[PDB]
Amino acid sequence: VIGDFNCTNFAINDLNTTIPRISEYVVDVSYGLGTYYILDRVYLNTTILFTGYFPKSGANFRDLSLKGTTKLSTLWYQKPFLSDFNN
């Protein structure tokens, strides 16, 4: 459903094999994980605030492991792996 053109029409099924695996490791920004360096600004020996975009801690990672072995199903598209990329 993601594409808008037809390329292949063989070895296509609708078997339920999707697994929404949820990770058991929460976001830990205490060691710099998730923090991104500023595009051009650089600070030296400074502890300044930054109203940027960082991942919220206490939220477990949502794993998206998708592969294919000579067959593919249309079920992985849309729900539940494809989510609405809001911001």
Partner: protein, 55 residues
């Protein structure tokens, strides 16, 4: 394509690298290739949009 998929460089692949219909060269806003240290163990990404500007 309606059913996209990518191939590997190790051993073989189930299908071929054909998930679109790019028979010519399209127009891109950022097209280049960068090499990273493959010997590492982790890799972190970040993609956020602000005022219609990608990052």
């Amino acid at each position: 394509c309606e059913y996209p998929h990518t191939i590997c460089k190790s051993i073989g692949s189930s299908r071929n690298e054909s998930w679109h219909f790019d028979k010519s060269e399209p127009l891109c806003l950022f097209k280049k290739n960068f090499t990273y240290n493959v010997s590492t163990d982790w890799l972190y990404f970040h993609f956020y949009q602000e005022r219609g500007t990608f990052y």
